[PDB]
Ligand binder design. Structure first.
Ligand SMILES: CCCCCCCC/C=C\CCCCCCCC(=O)OC[C@H](COP(=O)(O)OCC[N+](C)(C)C)OC(=O)CCCCCCC/C=C\CCCCCCCC
Ligand SMILES: CCCCCCCC/C=C\CCCCCCCC(=O)OC[C@H](COP(=O)(O)OCC[N+](C)(C)C)OC(=O)CCCCCCC/C=C\CCCCCCCC
Ligand SMILES: CCCCCCCC/C=C\CCCCCCCC(=O)OC[C@H](COP(=O)(O)OCC[N+](C)(C)C)OC(=O)CCCCCCC/C=C\CCCCCCCC
Ligand SMILES: CCCCCCCC/C=C\CCCCCCCC(=O)OC[C@H](COP(=O)(O)OCC[N+](C)(C)C)OC(=O)CCCCCCC/C=C\CCCCCCCC
Ligand SMILES: CCCCCCCC/C=C\CCCCCCCC(=O)OC[C@H](COP(=O)(O)OCC[N+](C)(C)C)OC(=O)CCCCCCC/C=C\CCCCCCCC
Ligand SMILES: CCCCCCCC/C=C\CCCCCCCC(=O)OC[C@H](COP(=O)(O)OCC[N+](C)(C)C)OC(=O)CCCCCCC/C=C\CCCCCCCC
Ligand SMILES: Nc1ncnc2c1ncn2[C@@H]1O[C@@H]2COP(=O)(O)O[C@H]2[C@H]1O
Ligand SMILES: Nc1ncnc2c1ncn2[C@@H]1O[C@@H]2COP(=O)(O)O[C@H]2[C@H]1O
Ligand SMILES: Nc1ncnc2c1ncn2[C@@H]1O[C@@H]2COP(=O)(O)O[C@H]2[C@H]1O
Ligand SMILES: Nc1ncnc2c1ncn2[C@@H]1O[C@@H]2COP(=O)(O)O[C@H]2[C@H]1O
Lengths: 400, 400, 400, 400
């Protein structure tokens, strides 16, 4: 979109002015050579203040917002330079630099999504500090005694001084020699201390948030381990729990499915649940013929559970009541004595369907081959769901 | 209220003393010219210590509170200056400056609401640092060898030194030349390091809290996106969820209605719910004649839900049971084959009323035109509510 | 307890050694004058390593813990000073200073309750930095060329240099002149940068936690206000909600009773609930004769609710079901037309008792005079409680 | 595993290059003496870029990942040194140093578990800063005027300058004398300010997280104490609650069992619950003969509760319904008048079994000897469990 290109162009124009205005205040002879750009740049500025009125909600000129735009659109710089009027009034040429805050707001709004906000604020602060350093170096030159030194070396020395002061390094090889330079130095010292404190605070804020997920996982694991140590839990079970948390981190950054899915609204939660359990519940022979309404109601009630390697999901002879769907990993179905393996079931398969229709003991043992992500449906909830689908209840009773 | 103006006046008086007392300790000749203000200022102080006793709960003189007020109300400064007594005892003139902490407490209490507390602490620290810098410059002058330099240049040099030290820039063009100046320099170096660390910590605390809502939204979105990536969700559904979160941010800063309304007490929650659902439930033909008690009970149980563009709220033939109220956005009511559009419903309208009275299949499909903020009422909860209003139950049964 | 006094004495002894050992390494002549204290101090140290074995669980000598104690109990300093052996081996005299970490652990454990842990860590760091500054000044003197300067001025200059370096101020009036002094300066510069970064981090951590309750209240209020602004809530209701939050802050720091009471175990929660509702439920005529078991069961189920000024708690003719207990504030009981006031009820009184026994409409309107802290008991929960006390149910039915 | 040893070897090789390359750029004569190591080191690098392809998922050469590895595997350094080609093109020899970020990633991945991530980032930053300081000192030497000074003293002076600048101490005894040195100084000043801000931010982040559990406990206790102070709770009950929180901290760091056990999945939660309640529920005479299924169902529903010293768990004559299992601490069973002690029960014992079968009043009072960790089973939940085990219900009814 060309409007963003216009905003980038105005970024360039305001940077042009932030560079040129103090550098022209210290070197008046620089005015006329760059005059054809100045009229070009100022025109662009007068082009902007009516433009964004068509985008602010895609005319509150009396509000504090849009005040720096119009205040910085006045051709004060041209008049000040042309009139060669005295410096104490010439300083009003800087009023155009108030466009900087509006340009910062625009850049923040057009980079508010691709860039971390803390990093965006840090980068904006760094750019502002570089521009302020340029301005402060120009002021330092303006207070320096006249000399035959080339303008480039003068600017280099002033920028060296201002960087030495703002960074608080303070070599002191360049120091104020006059009372006005001393007052200016005091002001710049306070400003540099504030700017460097802002830099440090922004960096601290940025870096304190980097490992949020990993630090949350670590605090969770330490809490659990300390509590289990208090309860005198044996180290084997503690090792199994530690490796469970290792699995949870390496697979899904320690996030709980139960808590993540609550952050979605019901239509999106239903879409996600239908996506994850794709055809796994619509391939079950118990309710192949069921309507999609019953399928949706079943899908919304599946509870995620993770079983570790070798953990028993079902033991033969237990008065079980739950059916399980394998979302990831694999399980072995074993005899009641576990001396022989009836089957291996893998991702996309299911077991325990008999518990939903009958109330009989479990036919065979089920044991996880490794870390299995499974979904559990309780017969209590299955009956609750059947309570509102009499046709499906009749179908399943006929099957039973 | 004039009491706040009195507190501002005492702010001015304590700033007057914090400036004058060390500057008089270094320039005794400054005493008499400002004497008519001093008696004016000290009187104001003796006017204060009985005054706030009428406001402290709107007389605990033995408590640590109100101790700095009375301790700083003693006319020690006048006696010390008048007696021209020796400097080691003259330093007791500074006891009046203990009013500063009480004035800071007062300013914090009268600006505790309009101003962010972290920013308020930062500003108080900055003011304290400026006053301390003035005092330290006065001490530096007090340890300097006598000279014919004008008092203004002496103060400027001392303030330059103390600012250079406190900001930790340390040019070193002004350095202690005597052992007493060296001890003073060491003390001031430690104090300046502590003050600048306090400044940096306050700035870091302030800036780490700026984007709390945006950072919470970002961490939520990253958690959800990472989890959906683990579940191998298709990118179309991920895009729909991302645009849902974009809508949630751009409309309501990512806040959950369900969680915001829990932070209000029941009377205020009821007032808010009655305000939002204004006449939308009192215009429904199903219960036009119902009493306001039933209306309130219904209003408290409406559940907010957001549907994205093109999402199906109701599909024809479904065994639906919920009525929906459109709080924002618009929906289209479509035929069972969706090849024709029966109607468009907008903000303030409702659909699905038949499900509450009957138990019949849905007559027509309902699909969101865009992001719709809707309120859902389940027939289970509607029946729960009807259980306590037999007259309304009879009315609705007669309608059915 | 005298054991804490012993630990304070050993604090004094370890500070004595941390001062003396480097100062004796630079001034050997200081050894013999303080020898009678040294044997006194070292004896105290050899007295400690068997003592705390009786307190460590109120003998794991092979563990890393208690290793610095025994390692710092060896009389190495006495031998090094007496042998006047060469400096590269004389540096082993510093091994006694390893008592510092054990003394820091002891001080942290005996001040872990009266003092904020972050402030405790900051103070420990500051003390360690002062001791390290003393040691570094001694090293700087040890690398300085011999001179006739008095020892006091030499120490003052070295301490000035080390404070100037550690605080990163860096005047540079004292600088290394030799390669060994340059290497030492580099090491001390890195150490000072690390120490000052530690100071800044500790201060930032301390100050970022100061206003936790106030910042939580502010973020809550901003969230609620922003959400209500999105919902287009009228400014009058917003003002009422703002003043409700103001009341909540000024009374109880914004804490929710419902959430605070969940942080207590059941016996303590019951004790607190019995304390708050003291005789208010045991004075009700409905169940004066009830046993204390029923009283406890009733007391555990009272729900706190806050009503704002002028809010209607009960309106005449409503099909109400709740009884209310006034814990603070006062309410007015008014006629059905509100044109006359039947009564005013205050702290410790109750209203709405008829709703529990009968099912009749409310006899009169109840309206809050100001912010009232009330407790609500629902007839549904009252019936649940009566279900387990048949005698009390019979009593209340006889009353009805 | 030898692969980790290979990664450590490549750590050594990349450190070798990061040291040698700039030091050879400033001292070309250093090239040939270390040439037999260079060919040895570069070979190792060309050995790596095919190796990790077998481990990246235990070949995406077009991705940004693995780009620095191949870019840093080119023998550019050998050619640049052998060709003695001009310095502006010789600077390309540094391209090999891009191996540093890959080595940092590898070290982070192989130390991501034993080391706190914040501390790991801080240590990596410190190492990077030391290497950068070496490089910057080499650049400073490269811009220095030729002199007869020994290379060691030149390097020492350059390293002194760069450490003085990066730490922001800034003595200023060594300062740029030429415009190119001034530009280099400005760049290094900005880089050092950024690096020191990074150090401070990392330290602040690290130290702000140290006392997370203790600070959470303190904020909990302050919240509870403030709320109880508002409710005008008597100081005796407040003292009992404070000592309860002291017990909770000293035993289990203030963690709630109810919340810790929710962070485990159902199989691990069941394993932990079976471990804690080991034989305590399988020794009860009420259900000695019960199957392990009923035992598991009972075990999952035990609620933890802590009773303070002297607190009454059961009072004689109460219409109680709960059985209690002593996990830690001890209780006394006392007569109805409490004038005699029937028994003392300790860890691993139980009381209140009669309430589960009968509905009779409590036979005797039970009072905690000290802080008791107990588990409560309610008859309501016991009946819920019995509802699914008819055989056990028949057994317990026969016992009753
Ligand atoms: C990012 C935004 C940064 C803004 C800072 C820009 C400062 C530019 C100052 C140039 C002053 C100059 O260039 O000189 C001004 C006159 C001498 O002017 P002259 O050389 O014509 O005589 O000196 C003086 O007022 C001394 C310096 C006074 C600076 C006041 C700046 C106020 C900014 C707002
Ligand atoms: C609320 C406001 C309160 C204002 C209180 C003002 C008190 C001082 C007024 C006089 C003044 O302004 O005193 C200026 C002083 C020098 O005073 P003098 O020439 O009378 O000394 C005697 C010279 N003899 C010995 C050669 C004769 O010099 C100076 O600039 C001293 C510094 C002036 C204030 C700087 C504040 C910096 C902020 C932090
Ligand atoms: C914000 C609050 C700031 C407070 C700091 C105020 C410090 C004022 C010191 C003035 C000392 C002075 O002006 O001179 C004191 C005498 C020479 O006094 P003299 O010139 O009459 O001889 O020097 C000395 O004690 C050397 C300096 C000693 C400063 C002690 C300050 C204690 C503050 C509490
Ligand atoms: C809080 C804990 C603080 C501990 C720091 C204590 C440092 C004391 C150093 C005294 C060195 C000294 O006093 O001089 C040591 C010799 C010259 O010894 P000399 O004057 O007898 O010849 O110089 C040298 O090694 C140069 C300095 C070497 C310092 C190594 C300190 C190692 C600490 C662990
Ligand atoms: C993994 C470990 C890797 C070690 C790699 C070592 C590479 C350098 C070895 C040689 C050395 O050690 O080079 C010492 C250099 C001076 O070498 P040169 O006398 O041969 O120069 C030529 C002198 N000409 C022109 C008068 C003839 O001077 C120096 O101390 C240079 C600095 C030595 C290393 C400092 C590291 C600081 C840490 C950050
Ligand atoms: C951790 C990673 C650290 C990396 C920093 C390494 C910087 C090494 C610079 C050595 C420059 C040198 O040693 O000299 C380069 C020439 C003179 O080279 P010459 O003495 O042969 O004449 O001076 C110059 O370009 C002035 C210095 C320019 C440095 C550019 C470094 C770019 C790094 C990326
Ligand atoms: N031969 C088999 N092959 C595969 N799965 C089986 C086999 N026998 C039993 N199962 C599954 O093992 C489950 C154990 O619990 P159920 O008896 O409830 O339901 C059983 C089936 O889902
Ligand atoms: N012609 C129509 N115009 C507007 N709304 C309709 C029309 N026909 C059906 N509806 C609404 O569409 C809803 C679909 O669900 P119901 O059958 O429960 O209730 C239906 C009405 O609320
Ligand atoms: N004359 C009165 N004086 C005090 N309280 C009253 C009076 N009349 C009614 N009430 C109280 O007002 C309440 C309004 O609700 P109820 O009818 O449930 O119960 C009523 C009593 O608790
Ligand atoms: N003599 C006793 N010795 C040990 N425990 C007892 C004794 N008498 C009663 N109890 C226990 O005290 C409990 C008090 O509550 P119950 O009557 O429910 O169950 C009682 C038994 O568990």
């Amino acid at each position: 979109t060309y409007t963003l290109v216009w905003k980038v162009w105005i970024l360039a124009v305001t940077l042009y002015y932030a560079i040129r205005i103090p550098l022209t205040l210290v070197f008046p002879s620089l005015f006329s050579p760059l005059l054809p750009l100045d009229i070009l740049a100022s025109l662009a500025l007068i082009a902007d203040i009516p433009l964004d009125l068509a985008f602010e909600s895609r005319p509150t000129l009396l509000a504090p917002s849009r005040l720096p735009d119009l205040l910085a659109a006045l051709p004060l710089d041209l008049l000040v330079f042309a009139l060669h009027l005295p410096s104490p009034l010439s300083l009003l040429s800087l009023v155009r630099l108030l466009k900087l805050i509006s340009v910062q707001a625009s850049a923040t709004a057009i980079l508010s999504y691709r860039i971390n906000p803390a990093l965006l604020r840090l980068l904006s602060l760094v750019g502002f500090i570089l521009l302020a350093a340029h301005g402060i170096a120009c002021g330092w030159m303006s207070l320096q005694p006249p000399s035959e030194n080339p303008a480039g070396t003068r600017y280099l020395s002033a920028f060296y001084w201002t960087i030495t002061t703002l960074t608080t390094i303070g070599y002191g090889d360049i120091t104020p020699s006059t009372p006005t330079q001393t007052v200016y130095t005091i002001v710049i010292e306070l400003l540099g201390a504030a700017m460097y404190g802002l830099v440090i605070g922004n960096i601290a804020s940025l870096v304190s948030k980097l490992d949020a997920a990993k630090l949350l996982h670590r605090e969770r694991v330490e809490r659990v381990t300390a509590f289990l140590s208090y309860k005198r839990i044996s180290p084997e079970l503690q090792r199994r729990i530690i490796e469970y948390f290792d699995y949870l981190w390496e697979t899904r950054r320690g996030y709980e499915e139960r808590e993540v899915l609550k952050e979605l609204p019901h239509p999106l939660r239903l879409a996600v649940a239908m996506e994850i359990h794709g055809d796994v519940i619509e391939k079950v022979p118990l309710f192949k013929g069921a309507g999609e309404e019953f399928i949706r109601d079943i899908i919304l009630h599946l509870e995620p559970v993770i079983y570790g390697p070798g953990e028993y999901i079902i033991r033969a002879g237990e008065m079980g009541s739950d059916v399980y769907f394998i979302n990831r990993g694999s399980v072995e179905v074993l005899s009641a004595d576990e001396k022989t393996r009836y089957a291996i079931l893998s991702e996309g398969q299911f077991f325990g369907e008999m518990a939903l229709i009958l109330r009989a003991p479990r036919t065979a043992t089920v044991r996880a081959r490794a870390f299995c992500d499974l979904y559990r449906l309780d017969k209590e909830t299955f009956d609750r769901i059947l309570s509102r689908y009499p046709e499906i209840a009749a179908q399943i009773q006929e099957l039973a």
